[PDB]
Amino acid sequence: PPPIADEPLTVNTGIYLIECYSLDDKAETFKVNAFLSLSWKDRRLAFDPVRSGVRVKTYEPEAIWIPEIRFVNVENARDADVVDISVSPDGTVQYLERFSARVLSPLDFRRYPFDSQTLHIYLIVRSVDTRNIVLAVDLEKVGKNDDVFLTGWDIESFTAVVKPANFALEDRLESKLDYQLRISRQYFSYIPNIILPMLFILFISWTAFWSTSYEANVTLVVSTLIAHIAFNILVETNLPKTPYMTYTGAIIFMIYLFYFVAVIEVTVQHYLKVESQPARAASITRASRIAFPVVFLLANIILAFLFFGF
Amino acid sequence: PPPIADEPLTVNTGIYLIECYSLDDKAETFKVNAFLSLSWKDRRLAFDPVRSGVRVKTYEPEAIWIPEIRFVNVENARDADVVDISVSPDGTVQYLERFSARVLSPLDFRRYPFDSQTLHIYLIVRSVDTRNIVLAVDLEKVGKNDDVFLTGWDIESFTAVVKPANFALEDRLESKLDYQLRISRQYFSYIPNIILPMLFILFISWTAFWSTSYEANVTLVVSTLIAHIAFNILVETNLPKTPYMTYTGAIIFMIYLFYFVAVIEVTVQHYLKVESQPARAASITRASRIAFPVVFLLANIILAFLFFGF
Amino acid sequence: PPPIADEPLTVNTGIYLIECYSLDDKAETFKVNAFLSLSWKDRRLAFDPVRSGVRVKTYEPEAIWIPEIRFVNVENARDADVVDISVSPDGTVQYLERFSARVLSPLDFRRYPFDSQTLHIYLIVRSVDTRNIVLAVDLEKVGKNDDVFLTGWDIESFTAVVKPANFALEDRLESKLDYQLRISRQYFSYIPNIILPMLFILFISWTAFWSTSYEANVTLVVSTLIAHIAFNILVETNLPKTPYMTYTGAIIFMIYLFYFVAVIEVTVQHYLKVESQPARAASITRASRIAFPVVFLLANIILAFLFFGF
Amino acid sequence: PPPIADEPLTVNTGIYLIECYSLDDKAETFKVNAFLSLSWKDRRLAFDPVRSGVRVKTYEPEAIWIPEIRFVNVENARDADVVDISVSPDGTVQYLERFSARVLSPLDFRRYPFDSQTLHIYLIVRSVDTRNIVLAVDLEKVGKNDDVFLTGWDIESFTAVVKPANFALEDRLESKLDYQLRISRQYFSYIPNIILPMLFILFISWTAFWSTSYEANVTLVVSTLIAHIAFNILVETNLPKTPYMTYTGAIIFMIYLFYFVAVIEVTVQHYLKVESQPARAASITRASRIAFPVVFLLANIILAFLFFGF
Amino acid sequence: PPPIADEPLTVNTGIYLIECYSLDDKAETFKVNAFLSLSWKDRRLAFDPVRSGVRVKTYEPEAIWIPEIRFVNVENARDADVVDISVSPDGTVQYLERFSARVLSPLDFRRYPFDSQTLHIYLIVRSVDTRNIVLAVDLEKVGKNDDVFLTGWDIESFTAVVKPANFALEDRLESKLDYQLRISRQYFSYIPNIILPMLFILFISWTAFWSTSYEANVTLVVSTLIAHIAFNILVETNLPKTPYMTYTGAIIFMIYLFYFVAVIEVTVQHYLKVESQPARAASITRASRIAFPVVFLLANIILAFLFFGF
Ligand SMILES: [Zn+2]
Ligand SMILES: [Zn+2]
Ligand SMILES: [Zn+2]
């Protein structure tokens, strides 16, 4: 029984994030539990303050006509249990629920460990004979407690795009709003646990420049290369199949090279020291000692700049 | 109370994919959330526009007779919540729901990382005394937003086979339609993370052709063969027990050989250098240096062609 | 309100497998989506064809008395949504649902990768004052499309045991039927990915018979033994804790031995070549070169026969 | 509307395990699907056999007063769907459901792989004005088919403690019963797959007593120690964070030592063979050859006894 | 229909933890199953003991007005099934449910393995026209059986903050209480399985001070550094991305250094023993033998103190 209007009836939305959790980098989803605040004039149940009852009148959902606010990017039906409904006398309805859905928003691992993100919640609303425009009431959208969690992420700001998007979808205009959650990652644990460890093994790799034993230079560079895959794999796991390149996928892959040419050198400093020409051997070996760290540190500046500095 | 007809009553279907996600290569399933649009003439509730009410009349599902449209390939009952029902005066009924099921469609990993796929959604409909033919209404089948996701897959086209398939099933004809989702994979992350790494280790393997130390030739070829299993295993994991052969299962397996005859060579260049005949040793070793990469690159041309080029 | 009979009322069952999927070797369960066809004479709603209505009369589930057909081996309540109900005039009722349950049937990994299986679905039915015998109507049991999936399994036949099993269970006889799904595995992917790889490493292991370097004979046999665990572990994972012995658990375990006595030999061809008695060393080493492959190939014939040939 | 009594009304319980599965060693839970049989005299619906109807009268749950039997140790609300309700004329009610809950019972990994366990199901019942004692009716508790599964566990006996426990809980006595499921593990797969493999690597470790090459004695003892962690880690995984000590956590940890003093010896048999005193070297090395296996086999007798023999 | 009051109606709460389980260090959540006890004077259904019925009168939830007690930090709607409702004659209502929700409380891994924690449960309550203050009734808050589980955690105390927090939230004051669960970890399994094993490998690392073979000093220090990553990784896994530093993240990271300067030394005791100056070599090497263990044991006193002793 939709409220007999004279024009597109506007419905007034808001979202108070009570809880944030389970942001899943692989699945590109997160889980939110929040308030959903709605309101609209249904003059059709305006009601004589003095003549009866009190200031505001409470209803159950079945009584009143309520607009179907479906979320757009959601695994399943959003799990909202209802909070209160209060009709003003001007037939203005005050609705409040408290849902929990898991939300499908995409992420940009281009700067993987040092990445900031922007999440989205949607809310469409399909029309019947009266159109529905949705729109944001900002006193009920300050939604986000002084408690919101989201492990391993610093939470920057919860806002929304005042102007809705009115589509036509199947001979019935719908109206969709954009609620925005901005977060930066707490890169850090990414250092003592990945970044540094990964580097260390790489240095020991090329300990093999100040050595001459092949057996202990392969027992050297090879043994560490194994370890690097242990990281490449550790990392590749908590991360989806990007069709593009990650920052650390980059340096992690750039690394694979420095092990190759490293192994190349130790290898040459052999078919070039068994050929009686150690003139050249401890010439090259002596050189690599510099080339390598420089080319590297150079490539990181080159690489790093390429990603953040552009 | 099914609508009294004169012939097989046609029901008119459509599907607007709102969401695609969780394509599971191992399980050969995916998850879709979409609109389901139905329609049919139930002259039995035609209704005098002028004489009463308005243009189109809204019903709840319990009122009208609605045809049971079950999906054919689905884990469980399809999770449809209903959107709107609108009856035309000519007794023409307009139905819309918005379901989410997980769908069991098979995949062909014959060209694994470089494979394109074709998914299916079905919709049978069993008859009573009047027969039901289903059929596609293509204005409601353009279904697939400008947003459809499906991580790590490029989505090519969502169409449907206009002609239904009318079975006899248990002394009651059913009618089944075929909705078709065509996708190609985003092979790519499969390169810096699998394809290349896998190759690199293989090359270092046969660094041991320009070497003479057995200890460092086993510390060599053996240490890398281990790593190859690390990949063979990484890959075998995100992939089901194909009764046929994958492309990368192929090359991954072809590889195992090049490590064998590699180890064979290093082994021979020993019971053939301890037998005082290094005439032959650094003859063979000198040879392998060429045989190997060639036979390989040859075998990949041979292999590759065999899969894609046919 | 159960149908007033003169003897045990027979209910007539059938199952049309629409979908098969998610066979879980570890959990020993699978998931089926199929038709469930029932029928019985409830003379109590026989109905004068001419005198009223038509040939067959349609009912909703609440109207008629329907027999409770519970499945015996199921995680949870079977998820059946209903298809059609049609009463013949002789008071003969025609019932059809389309359930999806996950089914707990056990498997015999005695021939693991080369194993055929036999799955079960049950259907008991508890009596009240009239007994219920169930029984199979074979036109509705040809159930199994020309499409049934079940990844990595060849599907052999879907039949059923005509004679039911009438128990006494708690002062009320129940009646249980046995629907039988026979499948053989698509062993194959088990070869390029497990069987062969596993063998190769074993051969390279004993490359160390044509070698004399201990360092490269341990860097040899040891480095490969690691790899074998990689497989032993890979395999032990997609497989439950059998109280009995698997075929490949067998050969996988028989293998562990050939690495031991292998390492034993390399070890002895050392405290027996450092003891100045290489008379014996390259006598043993020379021997092992034959003993090993033979004892093995012998043990596999012995082993293989023991499992399949008996 | 609870049955007007003269004393604490006794309710008579029973449980027929139809299915057992998903015992989770880490989570210390399992999943059961079983019958729940209840009964009590509600004289309030006694009913004149002759004067009307028949022997026993069937009700739906809404009609009769039924006692709330909540299970005590359960993740969520127990998922019971109802089977039959039959009232005797003496107003004696016969209730049957068939629930499936996942149950939280603790385990004692003190003898980990060789451990027998005892599981628990509870059933409290809170009173109103008449008290409720629960109690067991043992013809309906023989519950446990000739089919109950529970992978990798031998099932010993399903009994129950006849005497309930009547608490006071919040100014209302509740009554709790204890249903007991006793199981021993199928240790076995724990041998070819953990126990033996683990030992083997340990022996090869100390192959390095009959050797003199440091490079091949570290390439020896070190290479195997790695493998041991591979097991320590494999094992630690399928097992929770015991605040106490496991049996295999013990021997697995005792092992770590024999690798240490092993490495110690090889290390000493070096700064004691580079110090020109091989008088002592192949004296110690010669000794270790015995000390080690003995101390070990001794420590296992010591250890093993400590756990099982006490 | 809320109870007509003269002032802010106080609602009286309590929680009897029946079950604790699934505390998830990564996710920072846990799962509780407990009683929720409420009460308030609704003089509006006070009721003449003598004049009718009995001492206390039982209602179903639909009859009475009940206050919406939502939990503040919860993944989803709290899964409460209801226990009993009893109205006193003074119109005092006695409510009891038994919910199970999973609860989102944060943890402080600053002293990781040796960390005590404090969990929280909340309960807000939004007002209408009469305000609601919540408050704690301590006879129903002794909640926590003599059975509460929580694997790998010693449970210290379940209390609550008597004074509620009355917010203004969206032109309606809500009232929130704080239920407090204090737990310390059962660090211990953290020793035979992490702490010790991790130390051992570190000592063997620097076995390479009493050695001179580079090949066996890299086959030494390098082979163990690999193992250390095996732990660094094992540990980093059961632990979230702390924006701060863990205690063991500390020592685990401090360790990485002692392997570096260790490898540095072995490396120098080479380009300083190939330079004919073993004057210095077995001077340094002789020194490290002390420096290392001391600096370490010193740094742990330094480190340890820094964390616990402050
Ligand atoms: Zn259109
Ligand atoms: Zn060596
Ligand atoms: Zn009283």
Short mmCIF file of N, CA and C in Angstrom, two decimals, chain B residues 26-28 68 70-77 104-107 124 126-128 169-172 174 176 214-215 218-219 222-223 225-226 229 232-233 236-237 240-245 249 252-253 256-257 259-260 263-264 267 270-271 274, chain C residues 16 18-22 31 33 35 37 58 79 81-84 86 96 98 100 112 139-140 147 149 151-152 186 188-194 196-197 200-201 203-204 207 210-213 215-217 219-220 223-224 226-227 230-231 234 289:
data_model
loop_
_atom_site.label_atom_id
_atom_site.label_comp_id
_atom_site.label_asym_id
_atom_site.label_seq_id
_atom_site.Cartn_x
_atom_site.Cartn_y
_atom_site.Cartn_z
N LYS B 26 38.34 -25.87 -8.15
CA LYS B 26 38.30 -27.22 -7.60
C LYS B 26 36.88 -27.84 -7.58
N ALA B 27 35.91 -27.06 -7.08
CA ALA B 27 34.54 -27.53 -6.85
C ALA B 27 33.67 -27.46 -8.10
N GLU B 28 34.16 -26.71 -9.09
CA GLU B 28 33.46 -26.47 -10.35
C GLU B 28 32.08 -25.92 -10.11
N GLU B 68 6.12 -22.98 -10.98
CA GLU B 68 7.30 -23.35 -10.23
C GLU B 68 8.49 -23.45 -11.16
N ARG B 70 12.16 -24.11 -11.07
CA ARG B 70 13.25 -24.67 -10.29
C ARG B 70 14.45 -24.56 -11.21
N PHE B 71 15.64 -24.30 -10.64
CA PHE B 71 16.89 -24.29 -11.39
C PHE B 71 17.40 -25.71 -11.40
N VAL B 72 18.04 -26.12 -12.49
CA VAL B 72 18.42 -27.52 -12.65
C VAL B 72 19.73 -27.93 -11.98
N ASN B 73 20.77 -27.13 -12.17
CA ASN B 73 22.07 -27.44 -11.59
C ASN B 73 22.42 -26.63 -10.34
N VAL B 74 21.81 -26.95 -9.21
CA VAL B 74 22.09 -26.15 -8.03
C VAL B 74 22.30 -26.96 -6.79
N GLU B 75 23.35 -26.62 -6.06
CA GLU B 75 23.55 -27.20 -4.75
C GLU B 75 22.24 -27.33 -3.98
N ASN B 76 21.67 -26.19 -3.59
CA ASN B 76 20.44 -26.23 -2.80
C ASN B 76 19.31 -25.45 -3.46
N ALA B 77 18.17 -25.47 -2.80
CA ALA B 77 17.13 -24.55 -3.16
C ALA B 77 17.75 -23.16 -3.35
N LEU B 104 26.19 -25.24 -10.21
CA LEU B 104 27.13 -26.30 -10.53
C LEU B 104 27.27 -26.41 -12.03
N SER B 105 28.25 -25.67 -12.56
CA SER B 105 28.69 -25.84 -13.95
C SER B 105 30.13 -26.32 -14.00
N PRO B 106 30.41 -27.28 -14.90
CA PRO B 106 31.71 -27.88 -15.16
C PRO B 106 32.67 -27.00 -15.98
N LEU B 107 33.96 -27.29 -15.83
CA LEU B 107 35.01 -26.55 -16.50
C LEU B 107 36.02 -27.50 -17.22
N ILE B 124 14.15 -25.62 -15.13
CA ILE B 124 13.16 -26.53 -15.69
C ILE B 124 11.81 -26.00 -15.27
N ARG B 126 7.90 -28.16 -14.60
CA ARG B 126 7.14 -29.40 -14.75
C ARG B 126 5.67 -29.07 -14.93
N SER B 127 4.98 -29.84 -15.72
CA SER B 127 3.61 -29.52 -16.12
C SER B 127 2.54 -30.27 -15.27
N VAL B 128 1.27 -29.95 -15.44
CA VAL B 128 0.24 -30.58 -14.63
C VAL B 128 -0.80 -31.23 -15.53
N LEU B 169 9.50 -36.38 -18.36
CA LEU B 169 10.12 -36.81 -17.13
C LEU B 169 9.08 -37.28 -16.13
N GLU B 170 8.87 -38.59 -16.10
CA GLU B 170 7.96 -39.23 -15.16
C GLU B 170 6.48 -38.94 -15.44
N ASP B 171 6.08 -39.17 -16.69
CA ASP B 171 4.70 -38.95 -17.10
C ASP B 171 4.31 -37.50 -16.86
N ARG B 172 5.25 -36.57 -17.10
CA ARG B 172 4.96 -35.14 -17.10
C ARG B 172 6.07 -34.37 -17.78
N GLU B 174 8.56 -31.67 -18.79
CA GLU B 174 9.13 -30.47 -18.22
C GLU B 174 9.74 -29.69 -19.36
N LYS B 176 13.00 -27.00 -20.18
CA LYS B 176 14.26 -26.47 -19.67
C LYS B 176 14.94 -25.51 -20.67
N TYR B 214 80.75 -32.98 -8.66
CA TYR B 214 79.56 -33.78 -8.50
C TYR B 214 78.78 -33.21 -7.29
N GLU B 215 79.48 -32.98 -6.19
CA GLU B 215 78.83 -32.54 -4.96
C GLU B 215 78.03 -31.27 -5.21
N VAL B 218 75.07 -32.10 -7.69
CA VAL B 218 73.91 -32.68 -7.06
C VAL B 218 73.33 -31.63 -6.13
N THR B 219 74.21 -30.96 -5.38
CA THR B 219 73.79 -29.83 -4.56
C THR B 219 73.10 -28.85 -5.49
N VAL B 222 69.71 -31.52 -7.80
CA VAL B 222 68.81 -32.05 -6.80
C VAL B 222 68.10 -30.93 -6.05
N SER B 223 68.86 -29.97 -5.53
CA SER B 223 68.24 -28.85 -4.80
C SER B 223 67.12 -28.12 -5.58
N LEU B 225 65.26 -29.60 -8.08
CA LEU B 225 64.19 -30.52 -8.38
C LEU B 225 63.18 -30.46 -7.27
N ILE B 226 63.69 -30.35 -6.04
CA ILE B 226 62.85 -30.13 -4.87
C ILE B 226 61.89 -28.96 -5.11
N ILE B 229 58.89 -29.53 -7.34
CA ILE B 229 57.81 -30.21 -6.67
C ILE B 229 56.98 -29.21 -5.90
N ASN B 232 54.87 -27.99 -8.65
CA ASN B 232 53.96 -29.05 -9.09
C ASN B 232 52.84 -29.17 -8.06
N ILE B 233 53.19 -28.99 -6.79
CA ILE B 233 52.25 -29.19 -5.68
C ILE B 233 51.35 -27.98 -5.46
N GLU B 236 48.81 -28.22 -8.42
CA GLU B 236 47.95 -29.39 -8.37
C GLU B 236 46.86 -29.14 -7.37
N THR B 237 47.10 -28.16 -6.51
CA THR B 237 46.21 -27.86 -5.41
C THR B 237 44.97 -27.09 -5.84
N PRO B 240 41.20 -29.57 -9.78
CA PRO B 240 40.59 -30.88 -9.54
C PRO B 240 41.24 -32.06 -10.26
N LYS B 241 40.76 -33.24 -9.89
CA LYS B 241 41.33 -34.46 -10.42
C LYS B 241 40.73 -34.73 -11.79
N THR B 242 41.16 -33.91 -12.74
CA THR B 242 40.92 -34.12 -14.16
C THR B 242 41.21 -35.57 -14.58
N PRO B 243 40.29 -36.19 -15.32
CA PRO B 243 40.50 -37.54 -15.85
C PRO B 243 41.27 -37.45 -17.16
N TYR B 244 41.53 -36.21 -17.54
CA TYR B 244 42.25 -35.90 -18.76
C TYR B 244 43.50 -35.09 -18.42
N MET B 245 44.20 -34.60 -19.44
CA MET B 245 45.42 -33.87 -19.16
C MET B 245 45.31 -32.35 -19.35
N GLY B 249 49.78 -29.26 -16.64
CA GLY B 249 50.05 -30.54 -16.02
C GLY B 249 51.04 -31.24 -16.91
N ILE B 252 54.47 -29.18 -16.81
CA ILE B 252 54.95 -29.40 -15.46
C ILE B 252 55.51 -30.80 -15.35
N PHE B 253 54.92 -31.72 -16.11
CA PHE B 253 55.33 -33.10 -16.06
C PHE B 253 56.48 -33.36 -17.03
N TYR B 256 59.73 -32.63 -15.24
CA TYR B 256 60.28 -33.69 -14.39
C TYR B 256 61.33 -34.51 -15.14
N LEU B 257 61.13 -34.74 -16.44
CA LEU B 257 62.09 -35.49 -17.26
C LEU B 257 63.47 -34.82 -17.40
N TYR B 259 64.97 -32.99 -15.59
CA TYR B 259 65.73 -33.04 -14.36
C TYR B 259 66.31 -34.42 -14.21
N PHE B 260 65.63 -35.40 -14.79
CA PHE B 260 66.06 -36.79 -14.68
C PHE B 260 67.30 -37.03 -15.53
N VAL B 263 70.16 -35.08 -14.14
CA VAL B 263 70.83 -35.84 -13.11
C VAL B 263 71.57 -37.05 -13.70
N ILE B 264 70.99 -37.66 -14.73
CA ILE B 264 71.64 -38.77 -15.43
C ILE B 264 73.00 -38.34 -15.98
N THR B 267 75.58 -37.57 -13.47
CA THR B 267 75.93 -38.86 -12.90
C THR B 267 76.90 -39.59 -13.81
N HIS B 270 80.57 -38.69 -14.45
CA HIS B 270 81.28 -39.04 -13.24
C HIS B 270 81.80 -40.48 -13.30
N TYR B 271 80.93 -41.49 -13.43
CA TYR B 271 81.42 -42.86 -13.69
C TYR B 271 81.95 -42.89 -15.11
N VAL B 274 85.71 -40.80 -13.65
CA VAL B 274 86.45 -41.57 -12.65
C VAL B 274 87.03 -42.78 -13.38
N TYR C 16 15.12 -39.41 -8.97
CA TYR C 16 15.78 -38.97 -10.18
C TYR C 16 16.94 -37.98 -9.93
N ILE C 18 19.32 -35.36 -10.21
CA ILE C 18 19.43 -34.27 -11.15
C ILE C 18 20.86 -33.81 -11.13
N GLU C 19 21.42 -33.78 -9.93
CA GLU C 19 22.76 -33.27 -9.72
C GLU C 19 23.57 -34.10 -8.72
N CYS C 20 24.83 -34.37 -9.07
CA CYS C 20 25.81 -34.92 -8.12
C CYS C 20 27.08 -34.08 -8.03
N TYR C 21 27.57 -33.88 -6.81
CA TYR C 21 28.71 -33.01 -6.61
C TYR C 21 29.28 -33.03 -5.21
N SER C 22 30.44 -32.42 -5.03
CA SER C 22 31.09 -32.32 -3.73
C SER C 22 31.32 -33.65 -3.01
N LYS C 31 27.08 -34.79 -2.09
CA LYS C 31 25.94 -33.94 -2.11
C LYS C 31 25.15 -34.33 -3.35
N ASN C 33 21.33 -33.58 -5.50
CA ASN C 33 20.10 -32.86 -5.71
C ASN C 33 19.28 -33.72 -6.67
N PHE C 35 15.05 -35.71 -7.65
CA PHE C 35 13.58 -35.82 -7.49
C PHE C 35 13.27 -36.92 -6.52
N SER C 37 9.99 -39.18 -5.80
CA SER C 37 8.65 -39.53 -6.27
C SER C 37 8.01 -40.52 -5.32
N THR C 58 -5.44 -31.67 -8.15
CA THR C 58 -4.25 -31.14 -7.51
C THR C 58 -4.51 -30.68 -6.07
N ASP C 79 16.84 -31.01 2.30
CA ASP C 79 16.24 -29.73 1.89
C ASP C 79 15.34 -29.86 0.66
N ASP C 81 12.02 -28.96 -1.49
CA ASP C 81 10.99 -27.99 -1.82
C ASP C 81 10.06 -28.88 -2.71
N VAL C 82 8.73 -28.66 -2.71
CA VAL C 82 7.76 -29.57 -3.39
C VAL C 82 7.41 -29.23 -4.84
N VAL C 83 7.20 -30.26 -5.65
CA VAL C 83 6.97 -30.06 -7.08
C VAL C 83 5.50 -30.07 -7.54
N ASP C 84 4.80 -31.18 -7.31
CA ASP C 84 3.39 -31.29 -7.68
C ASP C 84 2.75 -32.43 -6.91
N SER C 86 -0.83 -34.87 -7.29
CA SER C 86 -1.95 -35.18 -8.17
C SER C 86 -2.65 -36.44 -7.72
N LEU C 96 5.54 -35.52 -5.76
CA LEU C 96 6.85 -35.20 -6.29
C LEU C 96 7.49 -34.00 -5.59
N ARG C 98 11.73 -32.16 -4.84
CA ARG C 98 13.05 -32.09 -5.42
C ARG C 98 14.04 -31.59 -4.37
N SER C 100 17.63 -31.62 -1.87
CA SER C 100 19.07 -31.62 -1.93
C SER C 100 19.54 -31.84 -0.51
N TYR C 112 43.19 -47.20 -3.04
CA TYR C 112 42.97 -45.75 -3.14
C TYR C 112 42.80 -45.18 -4.54
N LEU C 139 10.05 -46.82 -12.89
CA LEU C 139 9.98 -45.81 -13.94
C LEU C 139 10.40 -44.44 -13.40
N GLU C 140 10.27 -44.25 -12.09
CA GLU C 140 10.69 -43.01 -11.45
C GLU C 140 12.06 -43.13 -10.75
N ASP C 147 23.50 -36.13 -17.63
CA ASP C 147 24.30 -34.95 -17.30
C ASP C 147 25.02 -35.08 -15.96
N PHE C 149 27.16 -35.04 -12.89
CA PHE C 149 28.56 -34.65 -12.90
C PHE C 149 29.59 -35.48 -12.14
N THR C 151 32.78 -34.66 -10.34
CA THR C 151 34.14 -34.44 -10.78
C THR C 151 35.09 -35.55 -10.34
N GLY C 152 35.93 -35.98 -11.28
CA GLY C 152 36.99 -36.94 -11.01
C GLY C 152 36.48 -38.32 -10.66
N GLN C 186 38.41 -41.57 -11.39
CA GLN C 186 39.24 -41.17 -12.51
C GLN C 186 40.64 -40.94 -11.98
N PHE C 188 44.35 -40.97 -12.76
CA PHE C 188 44.96 -40.53 -13.98
C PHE C 188 45.73 -39.31 -13.63
N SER C 189 45.01 -38.25 -13.25
CA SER C 189 45.67 -37.04 -12.78
C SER C 189 46.62 -37.46 -11.65
N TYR C 190 46.34 -38.65 -11.12
CA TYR C 190 47.15 -39.26 -10.09
C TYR C 190 48.51 -39.75 -10.60
N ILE C 191 48.75 -39.62 -11.89
CA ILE C 191 49.99 -40.12 -12.46
C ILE C 191 51.05 -39.04 -12.75
N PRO C 192 50.72 -38.06 -13.60
CA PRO C 192 51.69 -37.02 -13.95
C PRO C 192 51.95 -36.14 -12.73
N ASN C 193 51.06 -36.25 -11.75
CA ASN C 193 51.03 -35.32 -10.63
C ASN C 193 51.48 -35.95 -9.31
N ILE C 194 51.42 -37.28 -9.23
CA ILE C 194 51.85 -38.00 -8.03
C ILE C 194 52.72 -39.20 -8.34
N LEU C 196 54.16 -40.80 -11.09
CA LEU C 196 55.44 -40.60 -11.76
C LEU C 196 56.36 -39.72 -10.94
N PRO C 197 55.98 -38.45 -10.71
CA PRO C 197 56.88 -37.59 -9.93
C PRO C 197 57.54 -38.35 -8.77
N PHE C 200 60.40 -40.94 -10.20
CA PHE C 200 61.55 -40.12 -10.58
C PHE C 200 62.50 -39.77 -9.42
N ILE C 201 61.99 -39.10 -8.39
CA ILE C 201 62.83 -38.72 -7.23
C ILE C 201 63.53 -39.94 -6.64
N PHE C 203 64.51 -42.68 -8.23
CA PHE C 203 65.57 -43.12 -9.13
C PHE C 203 66.82 -42.24 -8.97
N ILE C 204 66.65 -40.94 -9.14
CA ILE C 204 67.71 -40.01 -8.79
C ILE C 204 68.31 -40.30 -7.41
N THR C 207 70.84 -42.80 -8.08
CA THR C 207 71.91 -42.31 -8.91
C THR C 207 73.22 -42.46 -8.12
N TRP C 210 76.27 -45.03 -8.74
CA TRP C 210 77.33 -44.81 -9.71
C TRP C 210 78.19 -43.62 -9.30
N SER C 211 78.17 -43.30 -8.01
CA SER C 211 78.94 -42.18 -7.49
C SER C 211 79.74 -42.62 -6.28
N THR C 212 80.73 -41.80 -5.93
CA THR C 212 81.66 -42.11 -4.85
C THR C 212 81.75 -41.00 -3.80
N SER C 213 81.45 -39.78 -4.23
CA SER C 213 81.41 -38.65 -3.31
C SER C 213 80.32 -38.91 -2.29
N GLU C 215 79.60 -36.60 0.03
CA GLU C 215 78.93 -35.31 0.15
C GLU C 215 77.85 -35.16 -0.92
N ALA C 216 78.10 -35.74 -2.09
CA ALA C 216 77.16 -35.61 -3.18
C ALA C 216 76.29 -36.84 -3.24
N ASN C 217 76.55 -37.77 -2.33
CA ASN C 217 75.71 -38.95 -2.22
C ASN C 217 74.72 -38.77 -1.10
N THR C 219 74.05 -35.27 -0.25
CA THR C 219 73.40 -34.19 -0.97
C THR C 219 72.49 -34.81 -2.02
N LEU C 220 72.65 -36.11 -2.25
CA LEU C 220 71.86 -36.83 -3.24
C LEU C 220 70.65 -37.54 -2.64
N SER C 223 68.61 -35.22 -0.01
CA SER C 223 67.81 -34.22 -0.68
C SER C 223 66.52 -34.80 -1.33
N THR C 224 66.60 -35.99 -1.93
CA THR C 224 65.41 -36.61 -2.51
C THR C 224 64.43 -37.17 -1.47
N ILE C 226 63.67 -35.97 1.37
CA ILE C 226 62.85 -34.83 1.70
C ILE C 226 61.65 -34.75 0.74
N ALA C 227 61.94 -34.67 -0.56
CA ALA C 227 60.92 -34.61 -1.59
C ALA C 227 59.84 -35.68 -1.44
N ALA C 230 57.34 -34.70 0.99
CA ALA C 230 56.51 -33.75 0.31
C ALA C 230 55.34 -34.45 -0.35
N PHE C 231 55.59 -35.62 -0.95
CA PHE C 231 54.50 -36.38 -1.55
C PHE C 231 53.73 -37.15 -0.51
N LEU C 234 51.45 -34.67 0.87
CA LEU C 234 50.47 -34.21 -0.10
C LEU C 234 49.31 -35.20 -0.20
N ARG C 289 73.36 -51.53 -7.52
CA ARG C 289 72.91 -51.07 -8.83
C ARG C 289 71.88 -51.99 -9.47
#
